[PDB]
Design a protein around this ligand. Structure first.
Ligand SMILES: NC(=O)[C@H](CCC(=O)O)NC(=O)[C@H](CCC(=O)O)NC(=O)[C@@H](CC(=O)O)Cc1cc(-c2ccc(-c3cccc(Cl)c3)cc2)no1
Ligand SMILES: [Ca+2]
Ligand SMILES: [Ca+2]
Ligand SMILES: [Ca+2]
Ligand SMILES: [Zn+2]
Ligand SMILES: [Zn+2]
Length: 159
């Protein structure tokens, strides 16, 4: 019962890139994270490089211009705004983390799946196997799956 996008075509734009990973791997992690949610909804996501994207993806540090300051390495990993204009939908990742493609540091793909869930209107889950559980855990991204609770939540908002 959060806000929802009132359309099924949603654009995203990567505002800037963490130096922790190469550009190609950031693009891949974000694209695959959107695909997790498009696989179970009517939503489609396209990446744009200019113009007026719905979901801006940002890496930033500490106090970074909104009311949700980051805390250095550890603790908060990222945060995201629910659907809406302007800053609505945007997903912010704490650059004081070490973002990775793998099990070390903080896995960008898994964090992005969680944050995009918020960007689409989801809240938190009580299921410890749900990607929308409040605290991060690494799972083999090659075999990652949304939990049945995640699919229930997002199918209740769209379709
Ligand atoms: N507290 C913790 O365990 C870690 C600490 C990291 C550290 O200090 O080293 N930090 C977090 O989990 C933070 C802060 C939590 C808090 O203090 O309340 N959590 C976040 O940053 C989330 C913020 C938000 O709600 O948007 C972001 C988040 C959650 C996840 C996540 C990823 C995978 C899973 C998961 C779990 C089980 C199975 C599967 Cl498939 C997936 C669950 C959650 N990724 O990013
Ligand atoms: Ca942090
Ligand atoms: Ca936005
Ligand atoms: Ca970093
Ligand atoms: Zn922010
Ligand atoms: Zn969350």
């Amino acid at each position: 019962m959060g806000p929802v996008w009132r359309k099924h075509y949603i654009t995203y734009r990567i505002n800037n890139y963490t130096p922790d990973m190469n550009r190609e791997d950031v693009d891949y992690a974000i694209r695959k994270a959107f695909q997790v949610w498009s696989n179970v909804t009517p939503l489609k996501f396209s990446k744009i490089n200019t113009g007026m994207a719905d979901i801006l993806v940002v890496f930033a540090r500490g106090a970074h211009g909104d009311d949700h300051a980051f805390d250095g390495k550890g603790g908060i990993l990222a945060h995201a705004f629910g659907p809406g204009s302007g800053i609505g939908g945007d997903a912010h990742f704490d650059e004081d983390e070490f973002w990775t493609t793998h099990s070390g540091g903080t896995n960008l793909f898994l964090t992005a799946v969680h944050e995009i869930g918020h960007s689409l209107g989801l809240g938190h889950s009580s299921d410890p196997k749900a990607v929308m559980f409040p605290t991060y855990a690494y799972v083999d991204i090659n075999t990652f799956r949304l939990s049945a609770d995640d699919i229930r939540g997002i199918q209740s908002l769209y379709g």
